RNA sequence: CCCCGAGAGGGGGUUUUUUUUUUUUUUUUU
């Protein structure tokens, strides 16, 4: 594929001045970057900005029937797919590509394994007709950090997005539309964060393995520059309530356990901010749309 | 893109109306001397309807040939002869059960569509519409 | 306030004055029309320039072209049997760098770069249709002019308008309000790559953060507070 | 480049100008939609379908 | 469904509806697209078959180097009759050993010789079936190299009877295949000759089609 | 829910072991010579692994070759009859399988010495016979184990070992019954020291009790490392002596 | 073919091999076998299993499983799968093997269906999947020992409820713990190789890749059976055969089977 | 087993100055005056072990040599190998190694030798001396900076192969010595390479000169057309003993082959030398034969 | 034809824009020219890569025919023989469909080809000349030819139309139509209606989007 | 413009109707030298 | 740097899957 060219001065700067407690964008090895969350005119449509990184999450759902083997469960699927849009080095449509698989991995683990969505209350009429919720995540701008983006804009847009009201004669569906009645929230069990961890060494292998104090540096939501020079990556989510929803330590640079202990208490930090975060911004948008129904009738 | 313009351009001239595809659904029952007939309603509960797909197979292409399919589908549907569909009397097989945490619900019997071997009827094509291609 | 240009528009110039093309204006091979291409403003060189007057088009970009007699910032990302393979920009098409396009060559001494070094150079052929060259020397004097390896420091990546200008325009205040704060080396390339060491990592990083910044904004009266602030929150 | 889906009838279902070449004029395509109607006259009449 | 095709909707379920010793035509060159093609059409009994062959090559291959010529055969399921992919591979199989030894390759070195098959119109009129098109496949083949220009050492045909198949070449002297399936026990002799009865009128029929034609 | 004792008040549990037990660990080196440069079948439990390194060799393709370091690959193969309910579909190119490979390579390359293999491919090849239970911490065993056997140059073992989380009660090395009852966190320790390559929840646990996990599991792997260790120099006084 | 051999060793090969006294390269006559190695019964979680080991490293895996069908609905009551490491599950070696091996193996044809039957409804379904991990030649015979030895020490669940569902139709159940050992007669598959006139059983890499033709010939109950194809071992040596070399082949097979299934019958 | 030996088994998967075996991690000593070598790496004054395998102290260079491995090309190995590609200037033959040996168009000698005038079109017609499947005898000329190897045939000893048949063996089981090539009885001779690569031919006459129009011929796929059948099956003799002495972990010498030769008369037809009772045993014997020849 | 966009907005590629008309909102990007593919080189000009994302689901075979028409406007607007054995990358991810999808895909289409354009332009790609493009539908019973339709429009629409032409000689002279894409029950009077007011539309648009062009890119430039 | 139409179907014969085949219409078509080969078939689902 | 040659010549330094003990009055403090 196309690669990014980096060189030997670039690679003994960015991870000297990480020995000199600097990174590049002027933050802090435990500070994540700002999150903007912004709601377009309809429902589950959400764009969550990080910095130079922009991703644009859309939520949509259409009548369809449930699998044999779940009869009271509605469907659920959530699409990452990659395009040259976020630079030339993602090729359009690879989707067996390692940090891909591994994306696509840890948000389905975040969200769908988790049970964030209530698909039980995605049913309609059991073993026929049921709601199928999609997630399409629409990655815009890179500068690291696509699955923390990710995770938020899913989330964001899954508590954000409103179905059609639905009355049931029988097994006649009545989709009464937004002109008649408002539409219906979707059932959220958590709220899951991600918090992805980059670790570099600042010497060798051989003092990694055998070294006897550690020194391995981690910082927090690196950036491209900084994520393309990183020797092991570390994802853990978690929630309000205190629980680990899931970690991935794929393989990487072998870290102390103590410290990815730390590292997870760190994210809970950073995951509690977070989700009150998202809240506040819900409900100013629901406060804005209420206002403005209010002049719209005023002036009706 | 052969595929799509030839599925769009079909529902944009508006050749074939949903209602002429509507299955007038007939029923089977057992007479007497133990046989089998089937009476069909005309001119007037479980609704069906009839779909259609197509199989293009272009050989020794010289050039564009996306006309050529055009062409040929509109002759293809022109002799479309849609089968009689019919379902059994009272087939045994009914509601089927299936149980939650403590509630109960029925899920909706599903009725086996069936097929006549001979009968049909004639596709409803809006003749006024049928255009043809030329580039 | 300026005199924006579009393409396809009429060219001002008329046919009866000679005129030497470049960046942005096309002279059509079937036609013979010579017509604007892309979008920015016109520069028509005045009358009496030995009675050949040149017309360009300055226009925003940031995806390099190689043209011959540039000075440019590439690294070393592979190394073939007579020459070097260097990229000049991500996901460019490979530039060529010969082992005899060094001070003090021979055929029986490689140089000894490596793969990874920068190399600031300048391009000697930059055919359309084929591999474009660099070299690090001046092919009549034999000697380094200023070209060869980049030892250590930061590259900044920057778009080639803000290249130019920090290479040709003598007004331009970012290296003077750079020298008000600290001492510094730099190498600029016009293929938007910028190389800047300094004594200490700090004032490297400054550095890197102020042109960054400055790159940006792109305001001019705008670089003596940037450069103060970046300075200052490093001390911190 | 013109495509055209011309009903027997007069009217069109399909117009496609794809003008990358030489200027499409608009005798080009008059003289492109009285063909349409020529040919799809003798498509559509010739095999009594 | 599928993001490359046009299925139609899901819940959508396929129609079901209730309850001399052969004929044959050829053709050979009909197809501008390739450098062979050809058309066999059978009819007999309850069973009619048209399939079409075609041919593309030599053309390149780009990989390694190679003496000899590289042959490939697949076979396409039509628009009626369905078959498995595995049947379909191993009848692939099965011709590619068979034109292997007929195909002159030393004649094309580094290239590489593509036979296609369309199983276009397989009618089962009864009011391993893959057995009775197999000899058909053979003629269709062979007339299509033929039609091509690629040299073959001698006119491959072949026979079927009771899901026996053999192909024979220089006059029924020599096999070039054999294939057995479902069958009798110890009736080799007898199927042999019934089927060199059958490659025999085949290979008349194809030389008169590749002359007059 | 669970009507059988998971962990019954007399600290056994359903298969008999008690909650700081290992399953049966039993290595093998040297299965496949004619098939592999190293191999080892591994039967952790009812688990069955046969692992294949194919290498370091020639790649097949110039177009994939790296100058400065091998390639290393790693194939999972997780057959049809690997648990009691045959699948239907194939896992070849399930995304959960993809992840499995690109966990195992991302782990193997900060250990393995790759750059002293320049120009050359090194495959790895992996067969799951039979599934219960912890097969990502016996994939990682089977992997380290045929790597030594092929000689390829690595800085330590890496040992895999999986711990359930039964609401209070951990439970080192645990089957598949085990894991449908409960969270479990895979690990993936380096050597006999504390530092993790790989630390896998797919699982809600709480945060509290994750360093207590952490702390059973490592335990448990250094136990894995010295069993894989004892076994491969036995080995090896078999051979050296002839 | 897969083994890479130059001009010089092909020549002298062959003409070694196409002696009338046929020499083979490692001195076998034209109907002696290689040593192979068998297990079976280590897949506990399965209802039966085999693991057979050739000289030349080559291995393959068997496992059995079983599934309760209704045989009404179910026509195919044995099912073949192979898997060939180092291969697509769509190469051409793969389905091909695949759909000979579901041939040679099928419910009225090789294979005594009636011991898989449970009531007049609902009958067992048998799944056969091969696991080739390693073969240097045509794995159809190596293949055909593994299922043989596999489905020879392959045990069933046993019936508790009654075998009549037309009338009293009671839901199929089974005992605890008992289980009848499935009897049954699997077929074997031979492979042999045509060099010049002379015929070879169970043809090594080497002799393959300069062989004329080749044959696979099916067997079972004592005697020669679907399916029978001819095979090219490679692809830059075919030629045709004469008809008497058809009928040698099925002769030989005919009076050496019994010896190699006498070899392989052993509990 | 008339037919076939089958070896059957249930219930199971499978079967089942001292020298300091070390494993990876483990530490080997602690003086950093130490130089460590191929096996090993360091950190300050600790050394451990990479791999699986035995200490080795040469000097003040220590080394740890693993068990396994592939065979590792010395400057000046005979080896045997097969041209994989052809390409440019040079041909990529295999050894056995981690990577194909290279054999430049200047490193062979061209047909007719010292006589004939360079041509600039041999390099385009490389296919006609040597193609991808060739066998061939090479010295390993040089070795680049991975550890690859430049080979060479500058010679009448090296080149192209023919009249025989090929087989091979661990390269552990053959080492180096003054010679590779050796004459055996049965008019045959055996070409031993150091990478376990190994040619079994007919006794030419250059053979027999080594202890006691034809350079234009020196690159022909063809045999000798008068090759006895007592030769090819004394090839196939050599052949099974020398697969009987790998399977017993014997190290190849020219003596144990001929010795096993011999002693292999035993058993009439040929083909009885590859069942396993029979290997043992003729390994067996030949270790026992050199006890008590050597006490 | 109150349109509104914006230019280099995106960081990691040469150029970018988000054009906006009503409710069909398309962010565009423009990556070139760059090293391309074995398979995409042509000998002499430039390869263009032409990527469609749709606002909901995956990509599809609609979207197939979107890259498809929008080859056609962009390929003779590029002076492709400016870069031989060369690629540029243009991707559009329609952000907001503004009609019903299932039903039509007309406003995507002109939304898609005005921000390729602009991205173009952002890149600075040499462009032979400039490009507008409107969507414009005749309704059912008023027979009115409205340009710029709604989504409610579309749905009571006998005809949509997407027309996109090539301007030269600042955005006055029309040089060729680019694209027309008829669709629907149409007579000849209606087409040539159609054309005279859609070039009226078009050659606003072009005005409207040389003033956007200006805005944005003479800030960076200099006097 | 040659074509053949209902020759695949198989309600091709009113008096020999096919059993074996779900083709409701098809269509032949060769123009020149391209050949087009059309068939139609069905499918019925339940309307809610 | 390495290979080759009585004479500073030549060759190379590798490119979605083990989740289901079912029953008759509001509110507050007890
Ligand atoms: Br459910
Ligand atoms: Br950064
Ligand atoms: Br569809
Ligand atoms: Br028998
Ligand atoms: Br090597």
Same mark, same amino acid.
């Given at each position: 594929?196309k ?8 690679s003994?700067?960015?991870?000297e ?6 990174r ?25 900005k ?5 991703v644009?999450?859309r939520?949509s ?17 959530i ?11 993602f090729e ?13 991995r840890?948000?389905?683990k975040?969200?769908?394994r ?9 049913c ?10 999609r ?27 409103k ?22 929230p979707?059932?959220?069990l ?9 670790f570099?060494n ?9 070294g006897?104090?550690?020194?391995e ?7 491209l ?27 990487g ?24 975060q998202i ?6 948008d ?15 | 893109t ?6 769009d ?13 509507k299955?007038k659904?007939?029923v089977?029952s057992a ?7 089937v009476?069909?309603?005309?001119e ?24 050529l399919?055009?062409?040929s ?5 022109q002799?479309?002869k ?11 097989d ?8 403590g509630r ?16 049909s ?15 | ?17 000679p ?5 942005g204006?096309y ?5 013979q ?10 520069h ?24 011959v ?36 060559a ?17 391009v000697?052929?930059?055919e ?29 990546d ?13 007004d ?19 293929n ?18 102020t042109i ?7 305001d001019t009266?705008a670089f003596?507070?940037?450069a ?8 911190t | 480049?013109?495509?055209?889906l ?34 799809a006259?003798?498509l ?6 | ?12 379920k ?13 053709h ?12 066999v059409?059978?009819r007999?009994? *309850? ?5 079409i ?15 000899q010529?590289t042959?490939?055969?697949?076979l ?10 595995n ?24 290239? *590489? ?7 276009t119109?397989?009618?089962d ?5 893959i ?13 299509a ?9 001698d006119?491959?045909g072949?026979?079927?009877?009771? *899901? ?11 096999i ?8 009798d ?5 007898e ?23 | ?5 998971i ?16 399953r ?8 496949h010579?004619?098939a ?14 046969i ?5 370091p ?17 790693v ?9 009691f309910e ?10 959960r ?10 782990m193997?390359?900060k250990?393995?010495?790759?750059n002293?293999?320049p ?9 799951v ?5 912890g097969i990502?911490g016996?994939?990682?065993?089977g ?27 951990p ?8 894991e ?6 895979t ?24 360093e ?12 894995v ?10 080995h ?7 | 073919?897969?083994?890479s ?19 083979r390269?490692?001195g ?9 190695e068998?297990?079976?019964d280590?897949?506990?979680?399965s ?7 050739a000289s ?11 599934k ?40 009225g ?9 449970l ?12 696991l ?8 159809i ?13 392959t ?36 492979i042999?190789?045509?060099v ?5 059983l ?15 010939i099916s ?8 399916p029978?194809?001819?095979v090219?071992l490679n ?11 058809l ?6 097979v ?9 070899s392989?019958?052993?509990l | ?7 059957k ?10 020298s ?10 602690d ?8 096996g090993?790496?360091f950190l ?20 740890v ?14 080896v ?5 590609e ?15 040996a ?18 600039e ?6 296919r ?9 005898n ?24 023919r ?8 390269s ?6 003054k ?17 376990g690569y ?16 034809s ?15 007592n030769?090819?099956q ?8 020398i ?12 003596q ?5 030769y ?22 067996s ?7 008590m020849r050597?006490? | 034809?109150?349109?509104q966009?914006?230019?280099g907005?995106?960081?990691?590629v ?30 002499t000009?430039?390869a263009?890569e032409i ?22 406007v962009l ?48 890149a600075?790609?040499?462009l032979?000349?400039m490009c507008a ?32 032409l090539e ?8 040089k ?12 000849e ?11 009226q ?6 005005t409207?989007?040389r003033?956007?062009?200006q805005?944005?890119i003479?800030?960076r430039?200099?006097? | ?16 109707i ?15 030298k ?5 068939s ?9």
């Open positions: 594929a690669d990014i060219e980096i060189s030997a001065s670039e003994k700067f960015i991870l001045a990480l020995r000199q407690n600097y590049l964008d002027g933050r802090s090895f435990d500070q994540f970057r700002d999150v903007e969350i912004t709601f377009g005119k309809e429902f589950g449509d959400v764009s969550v990080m910095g130079n990184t922009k644009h999450c939520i759902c259409q009548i369809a029937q449930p699998y044999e083997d779940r009869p009271f469960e509605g469907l659920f699927v699409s990452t797919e990659i395009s040259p849009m976020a630079g030339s080095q359009n449509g690879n989707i067996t590509g390692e940090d891909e698989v591994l994306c696509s840890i948000i389905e975040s969200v769908r988790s049970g964030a969505l209530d698909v039980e209350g995605l309609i009429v059991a073993g026929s007709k049921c709601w199928a919720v997630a399409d995540v629409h990655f815009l701008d890179c500068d690291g950090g696509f699955i923390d983006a990710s995770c938020i804009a899913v989330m964001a847009g899954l508590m954000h997005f179905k059609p009201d639905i009355t049931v004669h029988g097994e006649q569906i009545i989709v009464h539309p937004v002109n008649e009645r408002e539409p219906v979707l059932g959220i958590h709220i899951p964060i991600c918090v992805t961890f980059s570099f600042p010497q060798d292998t051989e003092e990694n393995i055998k006897e104090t550690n020194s540096i981690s910082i927090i939501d690196a950036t520059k900084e994520e393309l020079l990183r020797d092991g990556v570390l994802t853990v989510t978690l929630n309000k309530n205190r629980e680990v929803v899931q970690v991935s330590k794929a393989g640079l072998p870290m102390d356990a103590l410290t990815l202990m730390k590292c997870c208490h760190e994210a809970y930090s950073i995951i509690e901010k977070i989700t009150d809240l506040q911004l819900l409900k100013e629901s406060e804005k749309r209420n206002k403005y129904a209010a002049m719209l009738t005023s002036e009706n | 052969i595929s799509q313009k030839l599925h351009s079909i529902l944009h001239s508006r050749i074939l109306p949903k209602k002429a595809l299955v659904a007939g089977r007479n007497e001397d133990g046989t089998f007939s009476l069909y309603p005309d007037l509960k479980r609704k069906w309807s009839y779909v259609l797909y197509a199989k293009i197979v272009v050989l020794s292409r010289t050039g564009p040939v996306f006309d399919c055009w062409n589908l509109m002759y293809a549907l002799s479309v849609l089968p009689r569909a019919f379902i059994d009397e009272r087939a045994s009914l509601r089927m059960t299936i149980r939650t945490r109960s619900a029925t899920i909706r019997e599903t009725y086996e569509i069936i097929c006549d071997q001979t009968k009827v004639p596709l409803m094509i809006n003749a006024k519409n049928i255009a043809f291609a030329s580039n | 306030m300026s005199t924006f240009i579009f393409p396809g528009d009429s060219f001002p110039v008329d046919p009866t004055t005129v030497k093309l470049g960046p204006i002279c059509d091979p079937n036609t029309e010579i017509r604007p291409v892309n979008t920015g403003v016109l028509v060189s005045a009358k009496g320039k030995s009675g050949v007057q040149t017309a360009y088009i300055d226009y925003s970009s940031k995806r390099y072209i190689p043209s007699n540039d000075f440019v910032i590439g690294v070393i990302i592979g190394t073939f049997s007579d020459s070097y393979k260097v990229s000049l920009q991500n996901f460019s098409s490979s530039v060529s760098l010969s082992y005899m396009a060094f001070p003090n021979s055929k029986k001494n490689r140089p000894t770069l490596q793969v990874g070094d920068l190399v600031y150079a300048r000697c052929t930059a359309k249709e084929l591999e474009a060259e660099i070299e690090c020397f001046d092919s009549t004097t034999g000697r380094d002019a200023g070209f060869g390896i980049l030892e250590d420091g930061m590259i900044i920057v778009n080639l308008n803000f290249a130019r200008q920090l290479l040709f325009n003598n331009f205040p970012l290296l003077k309000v750079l020298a008000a704060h600290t001492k510094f080396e730099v190498a600029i390339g016009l938007g790559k910028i190389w800047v060491k300094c004594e200490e990592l700090s004032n490297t990083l400054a550095c890197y953060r960054m910044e400055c790159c940006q904004k792109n009266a003596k507070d940037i103060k602030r970046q300075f200052k929150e490093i001390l | 480049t013109i495509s055209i011309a009903a027997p009838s007069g009217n069109y279902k399909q117009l496609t100008l794809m003008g990358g070449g030489a200027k499409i004029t608009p005798e080009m395509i008059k003289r492109s939609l009285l063909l349409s109607r020529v040919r006259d003798d559509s009449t010739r095999f009594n379908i | 469904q599928d993001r490359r095709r046009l299925l139609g909707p899901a819940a959508a396929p129609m079901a509806f209730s309850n001399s010793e052969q004929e044959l035509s050829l050979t060159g009909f197809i501008e697209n390739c450098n062979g093609s050809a058309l059409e059978a007999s009994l *309850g069973h009619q078959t048209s399939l062959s075609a041919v593309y090559g030599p053309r390149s291959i780009r990989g390694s180097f190679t003496s010529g042959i490939s055969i697949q396409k399921n039509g628009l009626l009759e369905k078959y498995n992919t049947e379909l591979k191993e009848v692939s199989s099965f011709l590619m050993g068979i034109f292997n030894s007929v195909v002159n390759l030393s004649r094309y070195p580094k290239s *590489g010789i593509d036979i296609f098959v369309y199983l119109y397989d009618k009129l009864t009011n391993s079936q057995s009775s098109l197999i000899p058909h496949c053979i003629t269709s083949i062979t007339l190299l033929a039609d091509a220009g690629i040299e073959l050492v006119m491959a072949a026979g079927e009877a009771n *899901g026996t198949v053999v192909s024979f070449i220089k006059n029924g002297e020599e070039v295949g054999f294939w057995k399936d479902d069958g026990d110890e009736d080799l002799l199927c042999l000759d019934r089927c060199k009865e059958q490659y025999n009128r085949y290979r008349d029929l194809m030389i008169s089609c590749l002359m007059n034609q | 829910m669970s009507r059988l004792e962990y019954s008040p007399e600290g056994l549990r359903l298969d008999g072991r008690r909650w700081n037990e290992l049966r660990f039993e290595s093998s080196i040297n299965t010579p004619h592999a440069d190293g191999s080892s079948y591994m039967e952790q439990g009812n688990n069955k692994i692992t294949l390194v194919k290498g060799k020639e790649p097949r393709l110039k177009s994939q070759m790296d100058t400065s370091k091998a390639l290393l690959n194939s999972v193969n997780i057959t049809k009859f690997s648990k045959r699948s239907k579909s194939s896992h070849k190119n399930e995304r399988v993809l992840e499995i490979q690109t966990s195992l390579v991302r193997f390359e250990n393995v010495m790759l002293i293999y120009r050359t491919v090194i495959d790895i090849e992996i067969h016979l039979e599934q219960d239970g990502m016996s994939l990682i065993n992997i380290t184990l045929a790597l030594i056997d092929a000689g390829i140059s690595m800085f330590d073992y890496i040992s895999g070992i999986s711990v359930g989380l039964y609401d209070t009660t439970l080192l090395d645990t089957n598949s019954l085990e449908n009852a409960m969270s479990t966190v690990l993936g320790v380096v050597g006999k020291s504390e530092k993790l390559s790989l630390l896998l929840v797919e699982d809600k646990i709480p945060l509290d009790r994750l207590n996990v952490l702390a059973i599991g490592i335990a448990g792997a250094h136990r490392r010295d069993l894989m260790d004892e076994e491969l120099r036995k090896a006084q078999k051979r050296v002596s002839n | 073919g897969h083994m051999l130059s001009v010089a060793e092909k020549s002298y090969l062959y003409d070694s091999l196409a002696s009338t006294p046929s020499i390269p490692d076998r006559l034209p109907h002696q076998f290689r040593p192979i068998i297990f079976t280590f897949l506990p979680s209802n039966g299993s085999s693991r057979i080991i030349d490293g080559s291995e393959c895996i068997v496992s059995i499983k079983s309760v069908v209704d045989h009404h609905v179910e026509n195919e009551l044995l099912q073949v799968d192979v898997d060939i490491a180092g291969q697509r599950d769509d190469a051409l070696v793969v389905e091909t093997i695949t759909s000979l091996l579901n041939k040679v193996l099928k419910s044809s090789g294979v005594d269906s009636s011991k898989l039957q009531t007049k409804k609902y009958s067992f379904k048998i799944f056969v999947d091969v080739v991990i390693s073969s240097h030649s045509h794995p015979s190596l293949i055909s020992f593994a299922i043989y030895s596999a489905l020879n020490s045990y069933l669940p046993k019936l508790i409820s009654a075998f009549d569902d037309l009338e009293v139709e009671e839901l199929p159940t089974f005992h605890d713990y008992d289980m009848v050992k499935l009897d049954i007669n699997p077929p074997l598959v031979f042999l190789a045509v010049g006139n002379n015929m070879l169970d043809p090594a890499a080497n002799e393959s890749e300069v062989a004329n033709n080749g044959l696979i067997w079972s109950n004592g005697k020669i059976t679907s029978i194809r001819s090219a692809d830059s040596n075919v030629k045709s055969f004469k008809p008497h070399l009928k040698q082949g099925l002769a030989m005919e009076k050496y089977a019994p010896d190699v299934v006498r392989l019958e052993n | 087993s008339e037919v076939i030996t089958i070896t088994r249930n219930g199971a998967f499978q079967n089942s100055s001292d300091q075996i070390v494993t990876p991690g483990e530490l080997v000593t003086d950093p005056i130490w130089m460590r070598g191929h090993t790496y300050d004054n600790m050394t451990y072990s990479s791999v699986a395998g035995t200490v080795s102290r040469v000097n003040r260079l220590l080394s040599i693993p068990l396994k491995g592939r065979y590792a090309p010395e400057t000046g190995d005979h045997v190998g097969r041209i994989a052809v390409g440019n200037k040079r041909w990529k033959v295999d050894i056995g190694g981690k990577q194909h290279v054999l430049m168009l200047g490193s062979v000698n061209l047909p007719g030798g010292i006589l004939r005038r360079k041509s079109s041999d390099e385009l017609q490389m006609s001396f040597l193609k991808e499947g060739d066998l061939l090479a010295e390993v000329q040089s070795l680049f900076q991975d550890g690859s190897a430049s080979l060479h045939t500058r010679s009448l000893k090296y080149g192209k192969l009249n025989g048949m090929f087989c091979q063996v661990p552990s089981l053959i080492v180096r010595a010679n590779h090539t050796h004459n055996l009885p049965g008019n045959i001779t055996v070409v031993l390479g150091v990478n190994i040619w079994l031919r007919k006794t030419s006459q250059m053979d027999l000169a080594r202890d006691t129009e350079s234009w011929q020196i690159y022909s796929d063809e045999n000798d057309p008068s090759i006895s059948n030769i090819r004394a090839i196939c003799r050599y052949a099974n003993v697969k009987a002495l790998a399977f017993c972990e014997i190290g190849i010498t020219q144990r082959i001929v010795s096993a011999e002693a292999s008369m035993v058993y009439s037809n040929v083909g009885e030398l590859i069942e396993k009772n029979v290997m043992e045993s003729i390994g014997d030949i270790l026992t034969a050199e006890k050597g006490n | 034809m109150s349109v966009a914006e230019i907005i995106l960081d990691h040469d150029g970018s824009s988000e054009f906006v008309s009503q409710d069909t909102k398309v962010i565009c990007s423009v990556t070139g020219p760059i090293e391309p593919k074995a398979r995409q080189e042509l000998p000009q430039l263009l990527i469609v994302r749709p606002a909901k689901g995956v990509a599809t075979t609609r979207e197939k025919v979107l890259e498809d028409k929008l080859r056609a390929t003779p607007l590029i002076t492709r023989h400016c870069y031989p054995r060369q690629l540029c990358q243009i991707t559009c991810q329609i952000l907001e469909s503004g009609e019903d999808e299932a039903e039509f895909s007309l406003r995507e289409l002109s939304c898609c080809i005005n921000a390729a354009f602009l991205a173009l332009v952002d600075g790609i040499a032979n000349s493009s409107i969507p414009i539908a005749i309704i059912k019973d008023t027979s009115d030819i409205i340009v710029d339709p709604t989504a409610e429009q579309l749905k009571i629409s006998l005809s949509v139309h997407t027309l996109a301007f030269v000689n600042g955005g006055k002279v029309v060729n139509v680019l694209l027309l894409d008829s669709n629907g029950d149409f007579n009077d209606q087409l040539f209606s159609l054309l005279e007011l859609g070039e539309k078009c050659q606003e648009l072009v409207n989007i003033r956007i062009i805005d944005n003479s800030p430039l200099v006097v | 413009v040659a074509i053949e139409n209902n020759t695949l179907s198989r309600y091709a014969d009113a008096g020999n096919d059993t074996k085949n779900n083709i409701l219409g098809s269509n032949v078509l060769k123009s020149g391209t050949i087009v080969i059309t139609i078939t069905g499918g019925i689902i339940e309307e809610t």
